[model samples]
Target chain A: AVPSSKEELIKAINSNFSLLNKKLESITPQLAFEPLLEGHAKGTTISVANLVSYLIGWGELVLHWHDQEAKGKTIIFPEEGFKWNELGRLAQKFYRDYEDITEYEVLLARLKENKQQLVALIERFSNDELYGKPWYNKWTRGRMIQFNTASPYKNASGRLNKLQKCLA
Target chain B: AVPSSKEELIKAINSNFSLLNKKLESITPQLAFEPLLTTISVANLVSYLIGWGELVLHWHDQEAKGKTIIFPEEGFKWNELGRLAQKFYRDYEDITEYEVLLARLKENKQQLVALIERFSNDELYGKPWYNKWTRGRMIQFNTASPYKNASGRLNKLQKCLA
Candidate 1:
């Protein structure tokens, strides 16, 4: 959800992101690194390490999307020439880029750092500014705030929740 | 998160709340009624949401009277939310009918939407010079509402069932 205020935005970020962190803490390294037997190829079949890496990478991508726009440059979301339907392919790209992080703590650290950076970046805006349109231009996503507020964390929560269910 | 305007707030409410609806559609009748091993059943979660709508309305009513906000009630801090959840669950413990829960959910949402419409953008999002919580403003409570046990706990339970 697009947060109505800065405080609301922060709280949403912390709550959803913290739940992901809390789930991370309880996950065994074996479980974190293990592959699932079934479900979505992007998630269940992939290791939790990749899952965490995907989140961190995607968080960075959203920030980068804004940064490029702020520099008065045109940027394509999910990447140049990629439409929303090709997200599965994008997920594969994310996995390929992030799959090499074998160490659980390294991925976790990067995830934390990415979340902090995202939150700090969000803190730069006022309530009106965050929820405002176009970010830099008409071509930008309807709301820059949603990339941080809704998109990345919703994906993170789904993956983390899916991973946790297997553990349970 | 605080919505930028009343339209934004209404949109946020409908969109997020509708997600719960979609999730509900996927649930089987037996699963909806059956209490999960860890949390309240899907049906009870809807009831829990209804209860929270009422609580949010009450808080606004109290705050308007210049009274101290007693969340859930007096004597309960935010940290003591587990007790509050137990109380909420107990209130709907006897509800065996999903339709009744559905009815309450729709009714309370209308009340919530009505209340949201009653406030202006500043009244909803702006902090008064002398605020009670010293956080930001009152609408922070409503935006925070979705992430509360009302939705978050339900989400976890829904995950388990999914």
Candidate 2:
């Protein structure tokens, strides 16, 4: 059903806008790369690409959500792991030129650490804090922009529902 | 180090206590062997595991801290994927009673979904949770825990750590 009222819109926003915001904001320039000035330029390049890889994923996730909602798309691999693999592939292609296991290994390691930290950190923060505040600066941008502009799941509105549906 | 102050204790609690809580809390109850439940449990389980899986890996990040914190006890694959795989296998073995599919595709679909959800859930929550928490709980009441009573990982902690 089309969002009927302000409350519904608010609920939609409450339900998804923060997620979109989190997905978009999580990757940044500071959170990104600086032309490989360090010893592990190759690793940095991979990390930066990994950061962008998440945005590319956001992009793909939006498309996936759009697919299910706009068009009754039946996803073959509803599993998050499969979707992540797909997102990684897309992220590699879009963010970097393509995938290299060496780069993936570096980012994969980084990703694992970030995952652990998130698990550790979020336990302390109230759920509202995570979903309510725009943890990054860009949430101030005017206009009802889709959250895909952020990283990890950039441009992934299409797949968000299906992805969350699987998780719920 | 022993927590020197309240702040230190907070930090320690923040870091260590949730080591178990995170896994338990993430679980949505509807996922427990549920039929009407769809992909939510599996998808959440996969994402939850993967999301944390990605985060935990940062300890070894070369660009950021560059500390060799992960896989401290052993080799590379054994450190990451191999460990997770081993955990998955152990969790799988913890449950061994199931034995049916179905006559039709629809029932088969729901039934299989239930099993898959249970499989993923049990591995992450059931076996590990018992190993981490329930076994300890059992010792208090003089109740024999399935884990330690059966010669579970409780006795092998130091060896596993080693």
Candidate 3:
């Protein structure tokens, strides 16, 4: 691919960054001040839903790249693909600013720690059986192998390292 | 395809039986159940978002099915397609048990109807654009492919239905 002009690069970066900020701001706690617990709970659930949506977007983008190439991209969360940590970091920033909860942050940290453990397991094993089992036994052993072999190792490992580093 | 086993048929009957309660419960007067409005709005928005998610899911599922000759499955929605509507109705039932807003239900209904209309208008900015879509744009287009290309009657029908 031809390199983008400096102006084009700047425009693309700024537009994407601005969009990222706007999306987070629009979808955060979604209130000006403290709210009723029911409202807060609703907001929390929606936040969780939105986070999952973004993660799925990341997955889809990876799948798009994989489909474009005959080789499948990373099925593993942190390897060989784009890390949408900026999205998570922006979410955390909103929580830190507007969402007042001691336990929530603790839970977030715990989640990060668990993700690290999963990533370490993937790195240690050449095969993907450890994490490839979907809830209903849908993911086959062959599928797992394909995922592990074709996915970007460096990008995935770097993403996992970044998440673990965040906890530290 | 083979027929459903007796056990599977029984499970299907039981699920349908359960939905009867949900269907009956998810209705109430506008005034006494303001909170229901919030849930309804959220659920509708969710339907829109998940509709988009299904486009991706449907494509993926179709591709997989081609390779494996399996049935295509759509996306997963966290809520089982407005099963939470039952919860909102429970709130209304509780309100009825307490005799809350009994006298004002009609008045509130009229008032809220106007407000509902206004909110619905806001959904489309009260001005339709040929290129603009507020909700699940891709999935709506994908799912309604034949109608999208056919006489533009689908657009008119959608507005009429809404």
Candidate 4:
């Protein structure tokens, strides 16, 4: 369901992220690195590591865009060089972003930290600040936050959950 | 989440039909039949639903007749819904009259609803209807999911056109 209020938005973020954390907490290194996920391209696959890396990219980008807006800068959505249609390339970039972080635990920690910053930033504003005006296009700030954070957590959790069930 | 019961599946089909149906009702003929748009026309959207919705009903009818059933119509592969959608556009492009297309679209939707109504719980959800997919799952994949997707897509088109 779509969140209509700040409280609901926060709950969605926390609830889904909590579920995701539980799912990821005991994941093994081998399973974490296994390329069992649907790839951004046709007829390919991505690893669980790539999945979280993509999540981390979107989560961080929301915070980055918010900070830019705070500083009176024009927020270049997704990034400075990308169009909305080219998000596959963006997801492709995100999968490569964390190749250096060999430890799943380290990547998980950063993912949690980034989510906490989102909740923290969300706490600073009124319901109006988050949901009242369009932050990007017709999506309100709260919707944008939900689109980037809560929505994907539920989506990624399902991917992770389905794989675990298959292997079990 | 996918509906697992005959009762639940029927309810979802009705609810989402109204959801997308309401959006379909709100569109003007001019905009619905126009060009460019999302690099996708509203006409293309309607045809895609009719094509898939009609195909689901078609597949069930063929199975009832004990004919060999093909997945996603005969030519299209499972992963090629994009290509399949283009075919839908052509299927209805002959009817320039928007209301005529909507009439057949609504006609097919009601037929599917009737098909589900007649299907027992076992027939719909008990076993694999196609490959490993339950009858209910396959129906939901093509029906409820498309209504929900089209409704959401209509919202984005609203934002873009606004």
Candidate 4 clashing pairs?
A: none
List model 3 lDDT by residue over A1-168, tens digit each. 211233332233334334433433332243212221111111122233223233333334333443443464334333343254544333323334423333433433433443344333334433333333441146443343233222322233333333334321
Off by over 4 Å in 4: B1-162
- Cα error, candidate 4, residue B111 (Å): 48
- Per-residue lDDT value at A66 in model 2: 35
Q: Listing every candidate in turn, what is its Cα RMSD in Å to the true structure after a full C-alpha superposition?
A: 21.5, 21.1, 21.2, 12.0
Give me the displacement of residue B58 in model 3, in angstroms: 39
Residue-level lDDT tens digits of model 1 in B1-162: 445455776777777666666656566667777877355577766656655677777887887899887765676776776676676677777877776666677777777878888877555433231211212233334333553434555556657632
Model 3 docking category: incorrect
Ranking by lDDT: 4, 1, 2, 3
What digit string (tens of lDDT, one per residue) describes model 4 on residues A1-168? 799889999999999999998888868877898665555433235678888888999988898898898899999977978998888768877877777888898999989999999999999989998888887888898998899899999998987778777763
- Cα-based TM-score, every candidate: 0.45, 0.22, 0.22, 0.51
Candidate order (TM-score): 4, 1, 2, 3
List the TM values for chain B, per candidate: 0.74, 0.20, 0.22, 0.93
What lDDT tens digits, residue by residue, belong to model 2 across residues A101-135? 33444543443443334334334545444444443
Model 1 spans > 4 angstroms off = A37-44, A136-144, A147-155, A158-168, B1-162
Cα deviation at A121, candidate 4, in Å, is: 0.7
Model 1's DockQ score = 0.01
For all the predictions, what are the DockQ values? 0.01, 0.02, 0.03, 0.02
lDDT accuracy of residue A14 in candidate 4? 96
